Design a protein around this ligand. Structure first.
Ligand SMILES: *[C@@H]1O[C@H](CO)[C@@H](O[C@@H]2O[C@H](CO)[C@@H](O)[C@H](O)[C@H]2NC(C)=O)[C@H](O)[C@H]1NC(C)=O
Length: 77
C-alpha cells in the first residue's frame, strides 16, 4: 500500500513513498489550506480516529484502497 508522505502540510507535495506495513488505506486530509498526505488504516477512517491521532478537530479526510490514491484531487476543495 504505497502512499504520499511529505515533511510538511503543503498543497503541492508530489513525492510518493511506501508507508511500511500497518497501513491499508491512504489518507488525504485537507484542514483548510493545509493538505495532510499520510497513510492511514481503514479501521481508523472515521470522524474521530483521525481528529484524535493528529490531535486536531476541524479538518477533512478521505481514505483510499489504491496505491498512491492521495494526489490532491479526490474529494475536491
Ligand atoms: C513500494 O514498494 C513496492 C514493492 O511492492 C515497489 O514496487 C511495486 O510493486 C508492486 C507489486 O508488489 C507493483 O504493482 C508496483 O507497480 C511497484 N512499483 C513500482 C514503482 O514499480 C514500489 O515501487 C514502491 N514504491 C516506491 C515509491 O518506492
Amino acid at each position: 500500500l504505497q502512499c504520499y508522505n511529505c515533511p510538511n502540510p503543503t498543497a503541492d507535495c508530489k513525492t510518493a513513498v511506501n508507508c511500511s506495513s500497518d497501513f491499508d488505506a491512504c489518507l488525504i486530509t485537507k484542514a483548510g489550506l493545509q493538505v495532510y498526505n499520510k497513510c492511514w488504516k481503514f479501521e481508523h477512517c472515521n470522524f474521530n480516529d483521525v481528529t484524535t491521532r493528529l490531535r486536531e478537530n476541524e479538518l477533512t479526510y478521505y481514505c483510499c484502497k489504491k496505491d498512491l490514491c492521495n494526489f490532491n484531487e479526490q474529494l475536491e476543495n
